[PDB]
Amino acid sequence: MVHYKLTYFAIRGAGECARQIFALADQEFEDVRLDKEQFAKVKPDLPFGQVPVLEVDGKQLAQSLAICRYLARQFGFAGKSTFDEAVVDSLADQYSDYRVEIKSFFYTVIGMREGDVEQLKKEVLLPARDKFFGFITKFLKKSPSGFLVGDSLTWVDLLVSEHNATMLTFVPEFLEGYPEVKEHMEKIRAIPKLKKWIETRPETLF
Amino acid sequence: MVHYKLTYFAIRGAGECARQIFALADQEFEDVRLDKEQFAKVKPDLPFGQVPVLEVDGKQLAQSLAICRYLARQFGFAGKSTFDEAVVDSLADQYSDYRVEIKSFFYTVIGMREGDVEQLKKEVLLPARDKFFGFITKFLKKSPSGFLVGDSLTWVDLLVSEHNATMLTFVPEFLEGYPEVKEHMEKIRAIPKLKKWIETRPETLF
């Protein structure tokens, strides 16, 4: 069959969505986890000199979003129509904008950058999250099934549920003003094959 | 009969790549260009409070990339295989990473934010275009046909060529060490249905 290989760091981060799609599909893949120094050696061979990279039968595909969308389409977690597919897409991009907003908080909290936590929480993380969650919860309120688009799992469900789960580990009161978002993170993560993966996957933080 | 409406500002920006596919596909649409006050009355009703928004028989879709991809799939400008569609997706995502890096210089020229144009250009813009252009050149040099993916026009071809033409009007030597980038811009813009649009669309600053 198709051979899949995902090359990324030894964290969840931007590789985890792919992993979560594979586990939802019962799809074997080679899960290759690099440290900093091995990234430095292989990166000139990557399409944009960056991880995560997906090879399918040796053919490279980079960019988490493009990878996550591709695998979802292959295994039917993209949306049930091309329009719902675009809607999934639009939420995943809104999520990414958010992530750009908070890049200075996250990289400080994960100990990879210099800065003041509580202050970067106040001025950068909490605003950015309010806007993002404000929009996310409108989608959730118009969804009786609890999934972000339609009434079936799509790849954004994973992006957002997994990020929230990670955040709680750094910011215990992250879901404070947002009961729907919390309900969503628990609904997605209790999906048996996903649940199995969260239990068995390598343990990192973030 | 499918009715399309594009809602955006009186500006090229995030709306234009949608407009260009509509030009290539010979597809009628309502080009709705709003001002400050108009946007503000409508803002609460947009899915993430932002334009561009596309209405497809009344269904809203936000986020420029989600929008262009969806349009591209409809009219055969997305890629020839779902993998190629992935690779186009990833160059679009790289393009946007590069727009995030250059934001600071972009809002300065545009007269949106403060900051020095000698500084920001040397320090932010040109090293970022250097990184990015090496990528685009690599895909170009891999292509016998001139497009960035495959032997056919794709929607990242439109985003990349429209940004270069735009940047060219703030930075006269953006593109000086980069003949194949220039040839790509010239080649995409000469496509007759797109040429006619560039010549007939309203003239705006950006």
Author numbering:
A (entry chain A), B (entry chain D): 1 to 206
Q: What's written in the study?
A:
The structures of two major GSTs, Na-GST-1 and Na-GST-2 from Necator americanus, have been determined using recombinant protein expressed in and secreted by Pichia pastoris. GSTs are homodimers that catalyze the nucleophilic addition of reduced glutathione to various diverse electrophilic substrates consequently facilitating their inactivation, and extrusion. GSTs are a major detoxification system for helminths, which have limited detoxification enzymes and apparently lack the cytochrome P-450 dependent reactions. The fundamental/active units of both structures are homodimers with the classical GST topology of Nu class nematode specific GSTs.
The orthorhombic Na-GST-1 contains a tetramer per asymmetric unit which corresponds to a Matthews' coefficient of 2.3 Å/Da and solvent content of 46%. The primary and tertiary structures of Na-GST-1 are more like that of HpolGST than Na-GST-2. All the main chain atoms for all 206 amino acids for all monomers were ordered in the Na-GST-1 structures however some monomers have disordered side chain residues, most prominently in the region from amino acids 105 through 132, interestingly these residues are include some of those that break the higher order symmetry of the Na-GST-2 structure. No such density was observed in the electron density maps for Na-GST-1, instead scattered density were visible in the substrate binding cavity. Interestingly, the G-site of Na-GST-1 cannot fit glutathione as it is abrogated by Gln 50 which points directly in the binding cavity blocking glutathione binding. A rotation of Gln around the Cβ will allow sufficient room for gluthatione to bind. It is plausible that a pH change may facilitate this rotation. Na-GST-1 was crystallized at an acidic pH 4.6 whereas Na-GST-2 was crystallized at a more basic pH of 7.5. Evidently, Na-GST-1 is capable of binding glutathione and like Na-GST-2 is catalytically active at pH 6.8 as measured by glutathione conjugation with 1-chloro-2, 4-dinitrobenzene (CDNB). Furthermore, the cavity is more open in the absence of glutathione (in the case of Na-GST-1) than with glutathione bound (in the case of Na-GST-2), suggesting a conformational variation upon glutathione binding.
